Amino acid sequence: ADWEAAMLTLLMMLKVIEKADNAAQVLTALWFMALAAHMAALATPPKLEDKSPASPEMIDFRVGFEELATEIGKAIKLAALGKVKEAQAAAEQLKTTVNAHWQKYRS
Amino acid sequence: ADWEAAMLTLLMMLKVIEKADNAAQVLTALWFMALAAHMAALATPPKLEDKSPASPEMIDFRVGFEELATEIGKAIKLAALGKVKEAQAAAEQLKTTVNAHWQKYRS
Amino acid sequence: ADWEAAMLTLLMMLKVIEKADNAAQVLTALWFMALAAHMAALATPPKLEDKSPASPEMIDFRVGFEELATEIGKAIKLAALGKVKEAQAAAEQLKTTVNAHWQKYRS
Ligand SMILES: [Ca+2]
Numbered sequence: 241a242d243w244e245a246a247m248l249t250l251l252m253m254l255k256v257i258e259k260a261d262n263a264a265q266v267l268t269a270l271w272f273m274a275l276a277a278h279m280a281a282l283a284t285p286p287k288l289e290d291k292s293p294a295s296p297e298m299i300d301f302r303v304g305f306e307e308l309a310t311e312i313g314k315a316i317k318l319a320a321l322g323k324v325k326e327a328q329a330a331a332e333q334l335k336t337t338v339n340a341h342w343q344k345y346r347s
Numbered sequence: 348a349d350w351e352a353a354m355l356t357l358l359m360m361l362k363v364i365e366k367a368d369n370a371a372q373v374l375t376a377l378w379f380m381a382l383a384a385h386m387a388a389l390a391t392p393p394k395l396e397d398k399s400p401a402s403p404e405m406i407d408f409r410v411g412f413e414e415l416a417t418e419i420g421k422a423i424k425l426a427a428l429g430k431v432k433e434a435q436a437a438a439e440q441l442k443t444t445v446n447a448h449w450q451k452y453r454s
Numbered sequence: 455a456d457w458e459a460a461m462l463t464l465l466m467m468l469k470v471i472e473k474a475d476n477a478a479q480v481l482t483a484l485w486f487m488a489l490a491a492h493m494a495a496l497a498t499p500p501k502l503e504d505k506s507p508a509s510p511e512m513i514d515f516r517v518g519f520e521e522l523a524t525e526i527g528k529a530i531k532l533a534a535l536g537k538v539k540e541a542q543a544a545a546e547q548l549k550t551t552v553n554a555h556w557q558k559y560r561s
């Protein structure tokens with residue numbers, strides 16, 4: 241998948257987590273979020289199509305994506321421990337990082 | 348998973364997409380298809396077991412697998428946008444690329 | 455996800471496989487197990503936090519993780535062929551490798 245194809249996957253999975261009832265539904269959706277970032281970190285968003293791979297703007301994008309995989313991993317551990325409530329709470333903060341990263345490179 | 352283990356995963360997920368009702372069912376199955384190709388592109392099919400990694404026959408296999416991940420990504424974006432109909436239509440063309448690649452290296 | 459976050463994912467997915475009714479439920483959970491190992495093989499467990507990357511104890515961990523991905527792949531192929539019974543049987547042996555690896559680096 242390209243960049244925004246996995247970005248929209250993160251957005252939809254956040255909508256699945258907010259309506260998920262058990263911990264298995266939250267965990268599987270969070271792993272789909274981690275998976276969507278596993279193949280999209282290597283892709284390039286539309287705005288940075290003509291930015292150097294060593295350009296600080298393109299470098300910012302990689303690390304901003306690295307925070308995302310880090311927060312997703314923390315919510316996965318909370319959902320893995322059975323804390324379905326605290327994992328959904330961590331998913332609401334994930335929604336902030338996903339939306340901020342998605343709007344900065346949407347164009 | 349080995350090569351044909353993920354090939355049969357693509358075939359079964361295509362059967363899940365053709366019977367999927369909502370867009371979330373199509374998107375998750377398509378990401379399972381992208382995931383099945385993410386770890387099987389690095390594996391080697393049975394026929395090419397004794398073919399050089401730089402052999403044009405083995406090289407053909409890698410690129411033919413690269414088309415597959417590209418088509419899967421396009422269907423993921425269609426399913427991510429909510430176009431459950433057009434994503435299923437793209438999945439039927441995916442069935443052509445999966446079956447052609449699966450039969451050429453099945454043996 | 456970090457190391458134990460994916461370790462607990464393997465444990466929960468084993469509980470999903472033992473209660474899965476059809477072959478698609480077993481296959482998807484097994485691919486979640488393969489996915490959980492795809493990003494956790496590159497992480498480091500708590501005990502080996504201060505062990506050299508070329509240390510035989512840290513080297514043992516990588517190969518012990520490599521057996522895990524190999525067994526998961528074999529159960530995926532059994533579940534892909536439709537053998538839902540034999541794949542669940544392979545999942546019970548997977549439970550031995552997961553639990554042995556999980557307890558050796560849990561601390
Ligand atoms: Ca609900």
Ligand SMILES: [Ca+2]
Nearest residue numbers: 365366367368
């Ligand atoms: Ca149906």
Ligand SMILES: [Ca+2]
Nearest residue numbers: 472473474475
């Ligand atoms: Ca049951």
Ligand SMILES: [Fe+3]
Nearest residue numbers: 278385386492
């Ligand atoms: Fe990878």
